[model samples]
Target: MRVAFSAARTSNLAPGTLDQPIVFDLLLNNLGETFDLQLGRFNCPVNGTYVFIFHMLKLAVNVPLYVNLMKNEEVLVSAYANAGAPDHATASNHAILQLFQGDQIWLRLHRGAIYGSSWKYSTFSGYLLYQD
Candidate 1:
């Protein structure tokens, strides 16, 4: 399943959860800010290797923008949403991570560049689940 959430700031997830619908407003970069987020602890909801994906859907501007995913204070994933072409493009990478029922998922904003809406009242919400 897919879930949507607007990243106002960084957020931490419960034991087992998924964040899919998170989006950033490329236009905000003109204001000197970009949508940033981080997730961790990601307690495995099941007894299997869960794959975590990082994506930079598209950024209208060609300026260099930073996106990151860290685990235990360590940088696990990173990207520059800037693309050479002036079109809708998506960049995604996956990693196999292990988790337990009591594990946690952590998310960070990197620096608060993302702006648009909040999950509490916005259509973009976060999602989490147990995958077997």
Candidate 2:
């Protein structure tokens, strides 16, 4: 069996100064209850192969943006965006992982980076690719 979920933020977020978790306020799908909306993380419900992807927008320039796709406390992948002039920019990243039950995955903003949100442009999604 496979499980999946996709979520987005309801309101735009301003640049953050410290490492913080990105909260997805809107749930598009939660087929297996694998994603926790309140905590902004996905908990592996069963041992399996899974894929995760996240994206964000950078509405301001001169401020760099850095985000990490985290597995538990480790960083699996990261995305960044920066500009010299005031303009719109975007950044995204994805990861495929073999996870054990009780493992977790989430998006975190690295300290000293900047990021923003707008409608569906900022998102977090994941799905089980296979079960063991």
Candidate 3:
């Protein structure tokens, strides 16, 4: 099966705790209902190679932000952004991870805060690229 989903933030996020998943509350596209928007996780619809991506914009609020591309509980890739002063800084990363079915993928906010609005500066997406 072809698995794909995209989601974006619709409100400002200042997580009370660090190393937590940032639930992208807005759905742009979800071809397969494999993504759990509530938990902010991709449910891994099938086994194969998949590409995951994320772009997060730190609010011009003088806070450094850390983001991690998590494969299950392990960190595969991470993004960082820090502003000496309040300014719009961005952090983005991508990965092509191959895994078994039911393996979860999600974005974790490690530190600081992010900006979100109708513009959706913070976003996450993944799609099945190959099936095994």
The lDDT for every candidate, in the order shown, is: 0.35, 0.80, 0.89
Tens-digit lDDT track for model 1 on 22-131? 43322211111112333322333344334454544443444333445544445566554445655333333444555444443333334212222233211111223334
Model 3, 1-132: lDDT tens digits are 888899999888898988988888899989888789888999887889999999999888888989999989999999999878989798899999788988999999999888899988889999999987
Considering summed lDDT, which 10 consecutive residues are worst modelled in model 2? 111-120
Estimate, for each residue in 1-132, the C-alpha lDDT of model 2 and write its tens digit: 679999887665553466788777888899898899878899999999999988777656567778889899998999988766676566798988899999989988774333433557778899999997
Q: How many steric overlaps are in each model, in order?
A: 20, 0, 0
- Comparing 1 with 2 on TM-score, the higher-scoring candidate is 2
Measured with C-alpha atoms, the lDDT of residue 12 in candidate 2 is 58
Structural RMSD, model 2: 2.0
Question: Against the hidden reference, what TM-scores do the models get?
Answer: 0.40, 0.89, 0.96
lDDT for 70 in candidate 3 is 93
Best by TM-score: 3
72: Cα error in model 3, Å: 1.0
True-vs-predicted CA distance for residue 17, candidate 2, Å: 3.5
Error of 2 at 67 (Å): 0.4
Ranking by TM-score: 3, 2, 1
